[PDB]
């Protein structure tokens, strides 16, 4: 249970904050968990997902589907992964969204900021 008075357990307020979060907060909201191998390697349970992360689906109709992220649609609260698509009847391939909470991060796109955030959260590369 909550103890502090600045935390609100009101469903209406929490839902409004989620649905009207700006993109900076949606980045944290769209965090994805690392695989078991990456969790062992880094020491990080989960990270905010990025554009070039290699990701594996662990839940849904595309379980066990690998693929590098193609976009982080923060407006739609989703991520778009290459080769995870739907072939329309006209033949066009459209992206299929899915939540990063249903994914596992299998390869990190590392830059200076990602590595610094890993050390911040307690990782060691």
């Amino acid at each position: 249970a909550k103890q502090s008075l600045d935390v609100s357990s009101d469903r209406r307020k929490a839902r409004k904050a989620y649905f009207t979060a700006p993109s900076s907060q949606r980045r944290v909201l769209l965090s994805a968990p690392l695989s078991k191998e990456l969790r062992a390697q880094y020491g990080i349970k989960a990270l905010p997902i990025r554009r070039d992360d290699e990701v594996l689906v662990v839940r849904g109709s595309k379980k066990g589907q690998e693929g590098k992220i193609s976009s982080v649609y923060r407006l739609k609260f989703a991520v778009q992964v290459d080769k995870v698509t739907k072939e329309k009847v006209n033949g066009a391939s459209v992206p299929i969204n899915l939540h990063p909470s249903k994914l596992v991060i299998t390869k990190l796109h590392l830059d200076k900021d990602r590595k610094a955030l890993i050390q911040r959260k307690g990782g060691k590369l």
Binding site: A1, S9, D10, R11, R12
Partner: protein, 258 residues
């Protein structure tokens, strides 16, 4: 207070083949010419609008409150009342259930759960855990989304991690002997809460509520006296002192004559 009255509606009167309810004036809206101000009207003020100076809290005499609290505590020691209240104490050796002050000094939630399992309240824990359900109405979107049963009430005398150790365990409540709320001692106005006393709490009960040789420490208070000496009215009725003066009885049912 201004709901349903943010209008300048006036009655059209008689002679216009419509009811005499006040109607919105103007035109070109669709709201114009429409009934207003009345409880029967759409958008009108409700009948007898609810006011905040309704009586919300209810006064109860201190002595009646303490009477109810004492009755609830005494019901916690009645084995059948706890079963009727539905507290899964069928695997407890005896009640009132008194445990050592090591429980008062307990620190972790896992070891509090272990204490509950070793003592016999884990079935009550499982009942609370498995009774969790979505509420059955508009209470879900009023921050009352789920409902579950009430578990054991662990009553202590001193707080040495007991409260925080049992804080996350579902259904368990923790209370000090000094307070001993009736809202926890008889939830739903139903007597027989399953209570786990620490030894210090059990010992301090006699100081808090008094005895035949000790005052209550609640100034001017003493425990209520029963209106009857014993509840064993069957035993009294069937005692020899009464049966001896009793005249002989009938057949417990009358044979149909004529």
């Amino acid at each position: 207070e201004k709901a349903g009255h943010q209008t300048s509606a006036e009655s059209w009167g008689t002679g216009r083949a419509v009811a005499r309810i006040p109607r919105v004036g103007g035109g070109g809206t669709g709201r114009s010419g429409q009934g207003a101000f009345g409880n029967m009207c759409r958008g009108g003020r409700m009948f007898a609008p609810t006011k905040t100076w309704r009586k919300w809290n209810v006064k109860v005499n201190h002595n009646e409150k303490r009477y109810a609290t004492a009755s609830a505590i005494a019901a916690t020691a009645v084995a059948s009342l706890v079963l009727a209240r539905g507290h899964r104490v069928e695997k407890i050796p005896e009640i009132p259930l008194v445990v050592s002050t090591d429980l008062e000094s307990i620190q972790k939630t896992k070891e509090a759960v272990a204490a509950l399992k070793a003592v016999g309240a884990h079935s009550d824990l499982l009942k609370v855990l498995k009774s969790k359900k979505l509420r059955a109405g508009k209470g879900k979107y009023r921050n009352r989304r789920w409902t579950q049963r009430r578990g054991p009430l662990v009553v202590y005398a001193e707080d040495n991690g007991i409260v925080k150790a049992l804080r996350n365990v579902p259904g368990v409540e923790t209370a000090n002997v000094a307070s001993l709320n009736l809202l926890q001692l008889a939830p739903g106005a139903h007597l027989g809460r399953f209570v786990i006393w620490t030894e210090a709490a059990f010992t301090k009960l006699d100081q808090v509520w008094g005895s035949e040789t000790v005052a209550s420490s609640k100034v001017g208070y003493t425990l209520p006296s029963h209106i009857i000496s014993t509840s064993d009215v069957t035993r009294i009725i069937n005692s020899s002192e009464i049966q001896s003066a009793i005249r002989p009885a009938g057949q417990a049912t009358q044979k149909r004559t004529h």
